[PDB]
Amino acid sequence: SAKYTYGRHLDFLRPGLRFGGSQSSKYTYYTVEVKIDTVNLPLYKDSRSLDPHVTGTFTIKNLTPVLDKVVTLFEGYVINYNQFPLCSLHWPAEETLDPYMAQRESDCSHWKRFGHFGSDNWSLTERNFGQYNHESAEFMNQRYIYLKWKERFLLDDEENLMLDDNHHLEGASFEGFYYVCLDQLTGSVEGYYYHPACELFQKLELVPTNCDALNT
Amino acid sequence: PFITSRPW
Ligand SMILES: [Cl-]
Known part of the structure; x- marks a missing residue:
């Protein structure tokens, strides 16, 4: 059918859901919290x-x-x-999507790094790297969901500035985006920050922290 | 973001 069937949300990707965890660096792990504010998956x-x-x-x-x-x-x-x-x-060949572009080798390697794909049919030059067959389940019916996240604004301590790739804070820069993977069976999230000018594989790990609140 | 913090 012509429609995706699911609001247009997932159990572990829905407005109001909070996650906690960390992002790694070479010296230590740093506490991270994420709040999902809006979700509008395609119809x-x-x-x-x-x-x-x-x-x-x-x-x-x-x-x-x-x-x-x-x-x-x-x-x-x-x-x-x-x-x-x-x-x-x-x-889509649209300027609003430029911040999510990467070399095809970068996308292929990062998605494969999460470790959930089969070993068959890999192709660097196919748009889904050979990993989507028409008998595959539609994306929301598979165990693992893949996403890219791009930070666009710096907020104040009460949740200020528009970000750009060439200006930064002492301790944090903003040139790249995250590859993200959500396990729909457990709610666990992993991710990797990527930009060619930055060291590879700073790793995000998150788990939902407010499921009890949402379910009560 | 990309973390650039020095060891501390
Ligand atoms: Cl749509």
Whole structure:
């Protein structure tokens, strides 16, 4: 059928959901909190919409001795293998999506790093790297969901500035985006920050922290 | 963000 069947949300990707965890660096792990603010997954397989599928807040705590909190607002897209395939170069050719572009080798390696794909049919030059078959379940019916998140604004301590790739804080820079993977069976999230000018594989780990509140 | 913090 011409529609995606699910609001247009997931159990572990819905407005109001909070996650906690960390982002790694070579010296230590840093506390991270994420709040999902909006979720608007596509209704149509042949969608024309370019509106972000997810928005939220990302907070990193105790980053340097003199910087106790960095709060950003991010937007993002959920890979659906159709309008939004695994390879960014095959996303709609629209300037609003430029911040999510990477080399096809970068996308392929990062998605494969989460470790959930099969070993068959890999192809660097196919838009889903060979990993989406028409008998595959539609994206929301698979165990693992793939997303990219791009931070666009720096917020104040009460959740200020528009970010850009060439200006930064002492302790945090903003040139890249996150590859993200959500396990729909457990709610666990992993991610990797990526930009070619930055060291590879700063790793995000998150688990939902307010499921009890949402379920009561 | 990308974390650039020095060891502390
Ligand atoms: Cl749509």
